Amino acid sequence: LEEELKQLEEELQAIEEQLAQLQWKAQARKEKLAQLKEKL
Amino acid sequence: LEEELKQLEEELQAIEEQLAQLQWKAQARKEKLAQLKEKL
Amino acid sequence: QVQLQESGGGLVQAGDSLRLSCAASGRTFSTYPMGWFRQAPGKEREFVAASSSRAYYADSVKGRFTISRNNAKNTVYLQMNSLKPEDTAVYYCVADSSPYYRRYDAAQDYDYWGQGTQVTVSSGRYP
Amino acid sequence: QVQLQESGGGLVQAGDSLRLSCAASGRTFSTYPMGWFRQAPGKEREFVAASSSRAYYADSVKGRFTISRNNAKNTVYLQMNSLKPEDTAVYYCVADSSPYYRRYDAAQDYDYWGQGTQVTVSSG
């Protein structure tokens, strides 16, 4: 059970790292998109 | 510019599908984690 | 052990229903997305339905099939209504154990596969 | 087509500072993570720094190097202080154009690579 806990905690950390980068990638694209739609 | 617009929107949609799944995966693991911590 | 055991297939008449069950008996399937693929005679494995943050359906089964889950029993269900002979196939339960992104309709992105259950739907015209 | 062009390398003495520049000239790069890798003699390309939601640094350069970006100019920079002979390497600018997850410290997860600029730090 202790190893299950550890692996669960590692998976959760791995998901947090993915979410951090993807949310930054989305925010950067939303900003660029807003600029482009204003231009168009 | 029109091509940039289309690709930005496709990328944002792909990022939103990833975020939806990754957040559900994280929430499910947090739920399991609390249960495991209660067992332990 | 780990198993995914499907049950509930069989022979039915066109227009009837069937409920497929997938009993996951490994461990911790609650954190995994789960779904169903089907392989018709001489055709490739085709996506049917998946469940994670929401339900996903192949266009050919929308409004007829409903996927649902019961975590307490570690099971996922495929309620199949208004069955057609074109739905005859072997139906496979799938699960995604990865903490990384996986595409819900890509067979190769699910790492656990059941053995499959046969669903046969007889046509309304009988000889 | 799309490229990343590094400049600012050269020969330097131990203890000095140096600033590397990388101009991205393909398309917009403000939505992409950008970073630096290096290859020293007889070693593999190794992660130095990356910039996205935040700055990341290899342990071997933390507190001596800074990564920054000028989005308007489509450029990324590597500010280097307290240079040592083991910092001698070819320094490569990199970019990640993917809308999918990519690991900031894995060379294979960057799809755009500059040609590299040589930095040489001679011993005192």
mmCIF file of C-alpha atoms in Angstrom:
data_model
loop_
_atom_site.group_PDB
_atom_site.id
_atom_site.type_symbol
_atom_site.label_atom_id
_atom_site.label_comp_id
_atom_site.label_asym_id
_atom_site.label_seq_id
_atom_site.Cartn_x
_atom_site.Cartn_y
_atom_site.Cartn_z
ATOM 1 C CA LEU A 1 0.000 0.000 0.000
ATOM 2 C CA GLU A 2 2.852 2.410 0.764
ATOM 3 C CA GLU A 3 4.284 1.938 -2.731
ATOM 4 C CA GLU A 4 0.798 2.384 -4.180
ATOM 5 C CA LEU A 5 0.597 5.677 -2.289
ATOM 6 C CA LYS A 6 4.010 6.782 -3.612
ATOM 7 C CA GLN A 7 3.134 5.898 -7.209
ATOM 8 C CA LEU A 8 -0.209 7.672 -6.917
ATOM 9 C CA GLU A 9 1.611 10.778 -5.620
ATOM 10 C CA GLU A 10 4.123 10.607 -8.479
ATOM 11 C CA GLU A 11 1.303 10.325 -11.012
ATOM 12 C CA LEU A 12 -0.431 13.327 -9.458
ATOM 13 C CA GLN A 13 2.811 15.334 -9.685
ATOM 14 C CA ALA A 14 3.285 14.272 -13.313
ATOM 15 C CA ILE A 15 -0.271 15.459 -14.086
ATOM 16 C CA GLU A 16 0.394 18.794 -12.345
ATOM 17 C CA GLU A 17 3.486 19.325 -14.521
ATOM 18 C CA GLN A 18 1.468 18.626 -17.690
ATOM 19 C CA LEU A 19 -1.342 20.957 -16.604
ATOM 20 C CA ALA A 20 1.132 23.755 -15.813
ATOM 21 C CA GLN A 21 2.675 23.704 -19.285
ATOM 22 C CA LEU A 22 -0.594 23.135 -21.175
ATOM 23 C CA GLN A 23 -2.336 26.010 -19.363
ATOM 24 C CA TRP A 24 0.583 28.282 -20.268
ATOM 25 C CA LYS A 25 0.411 27.040 -23.885
ATOM 26 C CA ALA A 26 -3.344 27.762 -23.969
ATOM 27 C CA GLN A 27 -3.054 31.204 -22.385
ATOM 28 C CA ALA A 28 -0.285 32.228 -24.846
ATOM 29 C CA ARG A 29 -2.414 31.043 -27.817
ATOM 30 C CA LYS A 30 -5.553 32.759 -26.500
ATOM 31 C CA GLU A 31 -3.620 36.031 -26.252
ATOM 32 C CA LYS A 32 -2.288 35.678 -29.810
ATOM 33 C CA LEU A 33 -5.733 34.692 -31.027
ATOM 34 C CA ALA A 34 -7.289 37.770 -29.411
ATOM 35 C CA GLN A 35 -4.730 39.986 -31.180
ATOM 36 C CA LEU A 36 -5.395 38.294 -34.532
ATOM 37 C CA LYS A 37 -9.189 38.556 -34.233
ATOM 38 C CA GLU A 38 -8.901 42.271 -33.415
ATOM 39 C CA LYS A 39 -6.694 42.756 -36.501
ATOM 40 C CA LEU A 40 -9.146 40.811 -38.707
ATOM 41 C CA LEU B 1 -3.318 35.578 -41.105
ATOM 42 C CA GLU B 2 -6.334 33.396 -41.948
ATOM 43 C CA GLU B 3 -4.196 30.254 -41.731
ATOM 44 C CA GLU B 4 -2.682 31.445 -38.445
ATOM 45 C CA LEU B 5 -6.219 31.930 -37.077
ATOM 46 C CA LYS B 6 -7.332 28.430 -38.075
ATOM 47 C CA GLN B 7 -4.247 26.731 -36.596
ATOM 48 C CA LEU B 8 -4.475 28.713 -33.356
ATOM 49 C CA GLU B 9 -8.091 27.580 -32.990
ATOM 50 C CA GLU B 10 -7.212 23.945 -33.764
ATOM 51 C CA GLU B 11 -4.367 24.046 -31.257
ATOM 52 C CA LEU B 12 -6.554 25.602 -28.572
ATOM 53 C CA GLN B 13 -9.177 22.902 -29.129
ATOM 54 C CA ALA B 14 -6.535 20.157 -28.769
ATOM 55 C CA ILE B 15 -5.232 21.803 -25.600
ATOM 56 C CA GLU B 16 -8.762 22.013 -24.178
ATOM 57 C CA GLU B 17 -9.336 18.267 -24.830
ATOM 58 C CA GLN B 18 -6.023 17.444 -23.088
ATOM 59 C CA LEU B 19 -6.846 19.679 -20.108
ATOM 60 C CA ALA B 20 -10.307 18.135 -19.742
ATOM 61 C CA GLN B 21 -8.859 14.621 -19.577
ATOM 62 C CA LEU B 22 -5.818 15.458 -17.428
ATOM 63 C CA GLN B 23 -7.941 17.330 -14.884
ATOM 64 C CA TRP B 24 -10.366 14.402 -14.596
ATOM 65 C CA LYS B 25 -7.402 12.043 -14.188
ATOM 66 C CA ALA B 26 -6.004 14.281 -11.431
ATOM 67 C CA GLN B 27 -9.342 14.599 -9.625
ATOM 68 C CA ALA B 28 -9.877 10.823 -9.678
ATOM 69 C CA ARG B 29 -6.397 10.295 -8.235
ATOM 70 C CA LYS B 30 -6.990 12.895 -5.488
ATOM 71 C CA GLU B 31 -10.103 11.022 -4.516
ATOM 72 C CA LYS B 32 -8.264 7.774 -4.358
ATOM 73 C CA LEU B 33 -5.488 9.403 -2.464
ATOM 74 C CA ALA B 34 -7.739 10.662 0.283
ATOM 75 C CA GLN B 35 -9.266 7.173 0.602
ATOM 76 C CA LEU B 36 -5.815 5.588 0.758
ATOM 77 C CA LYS B 37 -4.686 8.102 3.384
ATOM 78 C CA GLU B 38 -7.800 7.269 5.420
ATOM 79 C CA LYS B 39 -7.040 3.524 5.160
ATOM 80 C CA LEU B 40 -3.461 4.147 6.281
ATOM 81 C CA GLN C 1 -4.367 -11.238 -11.681
ATOM 82 C CA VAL C 2 -5.507 -8.128 -13.571
ATOM 83 C CA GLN C 3 -8.585 -8.718 -15.684
ATOM 84 C CA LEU C 4 -11.269 -6.891 -17.577
ATOM 85 C CA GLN C 5 -14.170 -9.301 -17.904
ATOM 86 C CA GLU C 6 -16.983 -8.472 -20.280
ATOM 87 C CA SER C 7 -20.410 -10.025 -19.907
ATOM 88 C CA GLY C 8 -23.855 -9.455 -21.359
ATOM 89 C CA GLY C 9 -23.299 -10.241 -25.041
ATOM 90 C CA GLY C 10 -25.260 -12.791 -27.001
ATOM 91 C CA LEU C 11 -27.946 -13.193 -29.641
ATOM 92 C CA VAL C 12 -30.817 -10.669 -29.872
ATOM 93 C CA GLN C 13 -33.382 -9.550 -32.436
ATOM 94 C CA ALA C 14 -33.083 -6.351 -34.420
ATOM 95 C CA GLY C 15 -34.595 -3.607 -32.298
ATOM 96 C CA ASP C 16 -33.825 -5.341 -28.982
ATOM 97 C CA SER C 17 -31.377 -4.124 -26.348
ATOM 98 C CA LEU C 18 -28.352 -5.551 -24.557
ATOM 99 C CA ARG C 19 -26.298 -4.283 -21.655
ATOM 100 C CA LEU C 20 -22.596 -5.023 -21.722
ATOM 101 C CA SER C 21 -20.757 -4.970 -18.412
ATOM 102 C CA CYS C 22 -17.017 -4.781 -17.942
ATOM 103 C CA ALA C 23 -15.875 -5.933 -14.523
ATOM 104 C CA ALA C 24 -12.402 -4.591 -13.916
ATOM 105 C CA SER C 25 -10.622 -6.814 -11.393
ATOM 106 C CA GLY C 26 -7.122 -5.542 -11.370
ATOM 107 C CA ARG C 27 -7.160 -2.643 -8.963
ATOM 108 C CA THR C 28 -7.799 1.132 -8.984
ATOM 109 C CA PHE C 29 -9.777 1.338 -12.193
ATOM 110 C CA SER C 30 -11.616 4.360 -10.835
ATOM 111 C CA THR C 31 -8.840 6.625 -11.965
ATOM 112 C CA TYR C 32 -8.913 5.192 -15.469
ATOM 113 C CA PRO C 33 -10.813 6.158 -18.582
ATOM 114 C CA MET C 34 -12.702 3.187 -19.922
ATOM 115 C CA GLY C 35 -14.468 2.399 -23.134
ATOM 116 C CA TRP C 36 -15.498 -0.104 -25.756
ATOM 117 C CA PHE C 37 -14.224 -1.010 -29.213
ATOM 118 C CA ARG C 38 -15.784 -3.515 -31.603
ATOM 119 C CA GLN C 39 -14.460 -5.660 -34.453
ATOM 120 C CA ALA C 40 -16.913 -6.800 -37.102
ATOM 121 C CA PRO C 41 -16.253 -9.901 -39.244
ATOM 122 C CA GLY C 42 -13.299 -9.143 -41.526
ATOM 123 C CA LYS C 43 -13.161 -5.466 -40.470
ATOM 124 C CA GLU C 44 -10.802 -3.556 -38.198
ATOM 125 C CA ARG C 45 -11.330 -2.683 -34.535
ATOM 126 C CA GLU C 46 -13.631 0.349 -34.340
ATOM 127 C CA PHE C 47 -14.190 2.840 -31.514
ATOM 128 C CA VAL C 48 -17.647 2.643 -29.925
ATOM 129 C CA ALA C 49 -17.748 4.692 -26.714
ATOM 130 C CA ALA C 50 -15.526 6.023 -23.920
ATOM 131 C CA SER C 51 -15.998 7.520 -20.452
ATOM 132 C CA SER C 52 -13.727 9.932 -18.578
ATOM 133 C CA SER C 53 -14.613 13.591 -17.880
ATOM 134 C CA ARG C 54 -17.599 12.950 -20.174
ATOM 135 C CA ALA C 55 -18.967 10.325 -22.519
ATOM 136 C CA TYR C 56 -17.759 9.999 -26.123
ATOM 137 C CA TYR C 57 -19.538 8.075 -28.869
ATOM 138 C CA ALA C 58 -18.815 7.004 -32.405
ATOM 139 C CA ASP C 59 -21.271 8.686 -34.781
ATOM 140 C CA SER C 60 -22.841 5.335 -35.730
ATOM 141 C CA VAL C 61 -24.068 4.696 -32.148
ATOM 142 C CA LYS C 62 -25.094 8.183 -30.981
ATOM 143 C CA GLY C 63 -28.609 8.175 -29.521
ATOM 144 C CA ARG C 64 -28.676 4.366 -29.294
ATOM 145 C CA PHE C 65 -25.756 3.435 -27.012
ATOM 146 C CA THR C 66 -25.074 4.938 -23.589
ATOM 147 C CA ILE C 67 -21.869 4.370 -21.633
ATOM 148 C CA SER C 68 -21.956 4.669 -17.854
ATOM 149 C CA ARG C 69 -19.809 3.684 -14.903
ATOM 150 C CA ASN C 70 -20.196 2.392 -11.333
ATOM 151 C CA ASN C 71 -16.914 2.926 -9.425
ATOM 152 C CA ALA C 72 -18.120 1.126 -6.285
ATOM 153 C CA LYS C 73 -18.372 -2.142 -8.255
ATOM 154 C CA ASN C 74 -15.361 -1.213 -10.491
ATOM 155 C CA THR C 75 -17.505 -1.660 -13.591
ATOM 156 C CA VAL C 76 -18.307 0.215 -16.795
ATOM 157 C CA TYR C 77 -21.473 -0.469 -18.779
ATOM 158 C CA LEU C 78 -22.564 -0.129 -22.396
ATOM 159 C CA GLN C 79 -26.341 0.025 -22.725
ATOM 160 C CA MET C 80 -27.153 -0.818 -26.339
ATOM 161 C CA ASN C 81 -30.616 0.029 -27.626
ATOM 162 C CA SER C 82 -32.276 -0.239 -31.042
ATOM 163 C CA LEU C 83 -29.724 -2.812 -32.122
ATOM 164 C CA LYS C 84 -29.102 -3.381 -35.827
ATOM 165 C CA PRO C 85 -27.467 -6.296 -37.684
ATOM 166 C CA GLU C 86 -24.667 -3.845 -38.518
ATOM 167 C CA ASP C 87 -23.886 -3.823 -34.757
ATOM 168 C CA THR C 88 -22.939 -7.527 -34.829
ATOM 169 C CA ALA C 89 -19.311 -7.754 -33.705
ATOM 170 C CA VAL C 90 -16.968 -8.765 -30.942
ATOM 171 C CA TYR C 91 -17.037 -5.955 -28.369
ATOM 172 C CA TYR C 92 -13.858 -5.255 -26.336
ATOM 173 C CA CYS C 93 -13.659 -3.374 -23.043
ATOM 174 C CA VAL C 94 -10.662 -1.032 -22.849
ATOM 175 C CA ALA C 95 -8.993 0.954 -20.064
ATOM 176 C CA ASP C 96 -6.320 3.683 -20.068
ATOM 177 C CA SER C 97 -3.887 3.443 -17.155
ATOM 178 C CA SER C 98 -1.631 6.309 -18.222
ATOM 179 C CA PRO C 99 -1.309 9.579 -16.268
ATOM 180 C CA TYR C 100 -0.384 11.228 -19.593
ATOM 181 C CA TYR C 101 -2.797 12.362 -22.278
ATOM 182 C CA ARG C 102 -4.353 9.560 -24.342
ATOM 183 C CA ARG C 103 -6.737 9.928 -27.317
ATOM 184 C CA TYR C 104 -10.150 8.486 -26.418
ATOM 185 C CA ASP C 105 -10.858 7.013 -29.904
ATOM 186 C CA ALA C 106 -7.400 5.515 -30.654
ATOM 187 C CA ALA C 107 -7.180 1.769 -30.012
ATOM 188 C CA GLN C 108 -3.409 1.912 -29.445
ATOM 189 C CA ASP C 109 -3.754 4.509 -26.639
ATOM 190 C CA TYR C 110 -5.564 2.047 -24.319
ATOM 191 C CA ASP C 111 -3.131 -0.231 -22.571
ATOM 192 C CA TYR C 112 -5.638 -2.747 -21.100
ATOM 193 C CA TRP C 113 -7.900 -4.865 -23.330
ATOM 194 C CA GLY C 114 -10.571 -7.372 -22.412
ATOM 195 C CA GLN C 115 -10.876 -10.710 -24.189
ATOM 196 C CA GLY C 116 -14.083 -9.611 -25.944
ATOM 197 C CA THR C 117 -17.722 -10.648 -25.967
ATOM 198 C CA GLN C 118 -19.762 -11.569 -29.036
ATOM 199 C CA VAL C 119 -22.901 -9.572 -29.874
ATOM 200 C CA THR C 120 -25.087 -10.967 -32.677
ATOM 201 C CA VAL C 121 -28.236 -9.149 -33.849
ATOM 202 C CA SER C 122 -30.565 -11.128 -36.141
ATOM 203 C CA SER C 123 -32.252 -9.222 -38.950
ATOM 204 C CA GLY C 124 -35.985 -8.509 -38.778
ATOM 205 C CA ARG C 125 -36.447 -10.580 -41.956
ATOM 206 C CA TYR C 126 -36.149 -14.252 -40.931
ATOM 207 C CA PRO C 127 -36.058 -17.335 -43.248
ATOM 208 C CA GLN D 1 11.857 28.025 -43.931
ATOM 209 C CA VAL D 2 11.635 28.257 -40.126
ATOM 210 C CA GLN D 3 14.931 28.665 -38.298
ATOM 211 C CA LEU D 4 16.607 29.669 -35.040
ATOM 212 C CA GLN D 5 19.887 31.585 -35.395
ATOM 213 C CA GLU D 6 22.285 31.876 -32.438
ATOM 214 C CA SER D 7 24.911 34.597 -32.012
ATOM 215 C CA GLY D 8 27.173 35.886 -29.279
ATOM 216 C CA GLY D 9 29.512 32.939 -28.751
ATOM 217 C CA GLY D 10 33.273 33.099 -28.842
ATOM 218 C CA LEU D 11 36.373 32.767 -26.693
ATOM 219 C CA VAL D 12 36.209 33.999 -23.113
ATOM 220 C CA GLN D 13 38.293 33.781 -19.946
ATOM 221 C CA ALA D 14 37.245 32.015 -16.753
ATOM 222 C CA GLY D 15 35.177 34.265 -14.483
ATOM 223 C CA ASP D 16 33.759 36.402 -17.300
ATOM 224 C CA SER D 17 30.156 36.926 -18.402
ATOM 225 C CA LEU D 18 28.664 36.424 -21.850
ATOM 226 C CA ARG D 19 25.191 36.825 -23.374
ATOM 227 C CA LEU D 20 23.905 34.523 -26.133
ATOM 228 C CA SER D 21 21.097 35.589 -28.491
ATOM 229 C CA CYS D 22 18.763 33.459 -30.586
ATOM 230 C CA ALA D 23 16.524 35.028 -33.250
ATOM 231 C CA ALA D 24 13.512 32.890 -34.254
ATOM 232 C CA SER D 25 12.528 33.847 -37.816
ATOM 233 C CA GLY D 26 9.966 31.269 -38.962
ATOM 234 C CA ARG D 27 6.646 32.499 -37.564
ATOM 235 C CA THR D 28 5.335 33.668 -34.208
ATOM 236 C CA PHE D 29 7.190 31.954 -31.331
ATOM 237 C CA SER D 30 5.476 33.633 -28.369
ATOM 238 C CA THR D 31 3.265 30.582 -27.935
ATOM 239 C CA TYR D 32 6.198 28.233 -27.855
ATOM 240 C CA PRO D 33 8.451 27.202 -24.951
ATOM 241 C CA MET D 34 12.033 28.153 -25.796
ATOM 242 C CA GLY D 35 15.318 27.143 -24.270
ATOM 243 C CA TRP D 36 18.993 26.265 -24.532
ATOM 244 C CA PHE D 37 20.917 23.088 -24.731
ATOM 245 C CA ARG D 38 24.644 22.508 -24.875
ATOM 246 C CA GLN D 39 27.064 19.961 -26.054
ATOM 247 C CA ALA D 40 30.478 19.796 -24.564
ATOM 248 C CA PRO D 41 33.366 17.766 -25.880
ATOM 249 C CA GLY D 42 32.556 14.130 -25.855
ATOM 250 C CA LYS D 43 29.255 14.546 -24.138
ATOM 251 C CA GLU D 44 25.633 14.408 -25.095
ATOM 252 C CA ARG D 45 23.479 17.443 -25.634
ATOM 253 C CA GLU D 46 22.432 18.564 -22.269
ATOM 254 C CA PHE D 47 19.717 20.754 -20.933
ATOM 255 C CA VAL D 48 20.708 24.228 -19.819
ATOM 256 C CA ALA D 49 17.569 26.376 -19.466
ATOM 257 C CA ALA D 50 14.012 26.694 -20.706
ATOM 258 C CA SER D 51 11.342 29.401 -20.523
ATOM 259 C CA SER D 52 7.565 28.827 -20.592
ATOM 260 C CA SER D 53 5.242 29.373 -17.649
ATOM 261 C CA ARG D 54 8.512 29.940 -15.753
ATOM 262 C CA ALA D 55 12.265 29.601 -16.111
ATOM 263 C CA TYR D 56 13.963 26.238 -15.570
ATOM 264 C CA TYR D 57 17.688 25.666 -15.106
ATOM 265 C CA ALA D 58 19.981 22.660 -14.971
ATOM 266 C CA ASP D 59 21.617 22.293 -11.566
ATOM 267 C CA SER D 60 25.030 22.902 -13.147
ATOM 268 C CA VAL D 61 24.097 26.508 -14.129
ATOM 269 C CA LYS D 62 21.599 27.586 -11.416
ATOM 270 C CA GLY D 63 22.475 30.935 -9.933
ATOM 271 C CA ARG D 64 25.008 31.759 -12.661
ATOM 272 C CA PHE D 65 22.846 31.771 -15.834
ATOM 273 C CA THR D 66 19.558 33.521 -16.680
ATOM 274 C CA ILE D 67 17.198 32.793 -19.591
ATOM 275 C CA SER D 68 14.996 35.581 -20.942
ATOM 276 C CA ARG D 69 12.795 36.331 -23.937
ATOM 277 C CA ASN D 70 11.876 39.334 -26.047
ATOM 278 C CA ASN D 71 8.523 38.256 -27.466
ATOM 279 C CA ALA D 72 8.135 41.284 -29.723
ATOM 280 C CA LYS D 73 11.530 40.548 -31.308
ATOM 281 C CA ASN D 74 10.909 36.775 -31.410
ATOM 282 C CA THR D 75 14.187 36.173 -29.503
ATOM 283 C CA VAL D 76 15.481 34.242 -26.512
ATOM 284 C CA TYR D 77 18.672 34.986 -24.591
ATOM 285 C CA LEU D 78 21.063 33.152 -22.282
ATOM 286 C CA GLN D 79 22.873 35.482 -19.866
ATOM 287 C CA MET D 80 25.988 33.730 -18.524
ATOM 288 C CA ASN D 81 28.026 34.773 -15.447
ATOM 289 C CA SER D 82 31.005 33.289 -13.559
ATOM 290 C CA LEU D 83 32.007 31.164 -16.549
ATOM 291 C CA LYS D 84 34.091 28.016 -15.956
ATOM 292 C CA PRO D 85 36.080 25.758 -18.329
ATOM 293 C CA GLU D 86 33.405 23.040 -17.997
ATOM 294 C CA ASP D 87 30.924 25.493 -19.559
ATOM 295 C CA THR D 88 32.865 25.165 -22.831
ATOM 296 C CA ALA D 89 30.417 23.773 -25.397
ATOM 297 C CA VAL D 90 28.330 24.400 -28.483
ATOM 298 C CA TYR D 91 25.194 26.153 -27.217
ATOM 299 C CA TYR D 92 21.959 25.338 -29.062
ATOM 300 C CA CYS D 93 18.770 27.360 -29.076
ATOM 301 C CA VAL D 94 15.584 25.228 -29.083
ATOM 302 C CA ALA D 95 11.831 25.669 -29.406
ATOM 303 C CA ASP D 96 8.767 23.504 -28.803
ATOM 304 C CA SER D 97 5.981 24.127 -31.314
ATOM 305 C CA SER D 98 3.723 21.337 -30.067
ATOM 306 C CA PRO D 99 0.283 21.968 -28.519
ATOM 307 C CA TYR D 100 0.813 18.627 -26.695
ATOM 308 C CA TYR D 101 2.845 18.098 -23.518
ATOM 309 C CA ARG D 102 6.626 18.138 -23.913
ATOM 310 C CA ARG D 103 9.323 17.708 -21.250
ATOM 311 C CA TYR D 104 11.400 20.883 -20.869
ATOM 312 C CA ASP D 105 14.663 19.011 -20.208
ATOM 313 C CA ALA D 106 14.428 16.332 -22.926
ATOM 314 C CA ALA D 107 16.297 17.233 -26.121
ATOM 315 C CA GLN D 108 14.023 15.039 -28.247
ATOM 316 C CA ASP D 109 10.919 16.973 -27.139
ATOM 317 C CA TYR D 110 12.040 20.166 -28.933
ATOM 318 C CA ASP D 111 11.211 20.111 -32.625
ATOM 319 C CA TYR D 112 13.101 23.279 -33.624
ATOM 320 C CA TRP D 113 16.876 23.453 -33.170
ATOM 321 C CA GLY D 114 19.346 26.176 -34.001
ATOM 322 C CA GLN D 115 22.719 25.446 -35.551
ATOM 323 C CA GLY D 116 24.564 26.352 -32.401
ATOM 324 C CA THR D 117 27.226 28.805 -31.331
ATOM 325 C CA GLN D 118 30.572 27.843 -29.790
ATOM 326 C CA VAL D 119 31.478 29.164 -26.325
ATOM 327 C CA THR D 120 35.002 28.490 -25.085
ATOM 328 C CA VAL D 121 36.101 29.300 -21.525
ATOM 329 C CA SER D 122 39.884 29.089 -21.060
ATOM 330 C CA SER D 123 41.405 28.332 -17.659
ATOM 331 C CA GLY D 124 42.924 31.064 -15.500
#
